[PDB]
Amino acid sequence: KVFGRCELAAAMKRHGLDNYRGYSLGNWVCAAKFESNFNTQATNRNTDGSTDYGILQINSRWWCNDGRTPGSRNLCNIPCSALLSSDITASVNCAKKIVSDGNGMNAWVAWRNRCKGTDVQAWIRGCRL
Ligand SMILES: [Cl-]
Ligand SMILES: [Cl-]
Ligand SMILES: [Cl-]
Ligand SMILES: [Cl-]
Ligand code: NA
């Protein structure tokens, strides 16, 4: 599913991401925009053989099982295919663990490089939230 910007912000707020671990909602919508263009079905292969999955491009080396990343963990305890559902529950729950891992949303390189330090509130401007 390809989410609308305000549509995603609302689903994200309902699932408890607004200021989760101190990160305002616009950070999460920004991250989704540049990770996946709001597409739940986005997948991307990494150089190390792992793959990023879903709206927030969660990686198979640490967070989900896809059966093809040797020596990897499944810390969110889910198949990576769950991260591609039009229901973003799996992705949000896993992102809560990821953002809690020590480095905040720096875990998302696209957030560090494209969202961090910017006016992220722009990503939720105009939405009925
Ligand atoms: Cl915000
Ligand atoms: Cl694996
Ligand atoms: Cl949802
Ligand atoms: Cl932090
Ligand atoms: Na894995």
Q: Which domains does the chain have, with CATH numbers?
A: 5-124 (1.10.530.10)
Q: What's the gap in Å between 48 CA and the centre of ligand 3?
A: 30
CA distance 61 to 42: 17
Cβ-based neighbours of 96, under 8 Å, separated by 6 or more: 16, 17, 20, 21
CA distance 116 to 106: 8
CA distance 32 to 87: 14
Query: Technique behind this structure?
Result: X-ray
Out of 52, 66, 87, 119, the active site residue is 52
Query: Which candidate, 32, 38, 40, 67, places its Cα nearest to that of 51?
Result: 67
Q: What's the gap in Å between 61 CA and the centre of ligand 3?
A: 25
7 is catalytic: no
Neighbours of ion ligand 4 (CB under 5 A): 104
Closest ligand relative to 18 C-alpha:
1
Closest ligand relative to 8 C-alpha:
3
What tokens does 10 get? 């609302």
User: Across the chain, where does the E strand assignment appear?
Assistant: 43-45, 51-53, 58-59
Out of 18, 35, 66, 119, the active site residue is 35
- The string over 8-44, giving b where at least 16 C-beta atoms fall within 10 Å of a residue's C-beta and e elsewhere, is bbbbbbebebbebeebbbbbbbbbbbebbebebebbe
CA distance 32 to 15: 15
26 HSE (CA, 13 A, CB side): 14
Strand-pairing partners, residue 20, are 23
Unique residue bearing structure tokens 């599913």? 1
Residue 76 φ/ψ, nearest 5 degrees: -85, -5
Q: Would you say 119 is a known binding-site residue?
A: no
Q: What's the gap in Å between 35 CA and the centre of ligand 4?
A: 19
CA distance 8 to 91: 12
How far are the Cα atoms of 35, 82, 113, 114 from residue 64, in angstroms, in the given order? 17, 9, 24, 25
CA distance 21 to 4: 24
52 is catalytic: yes
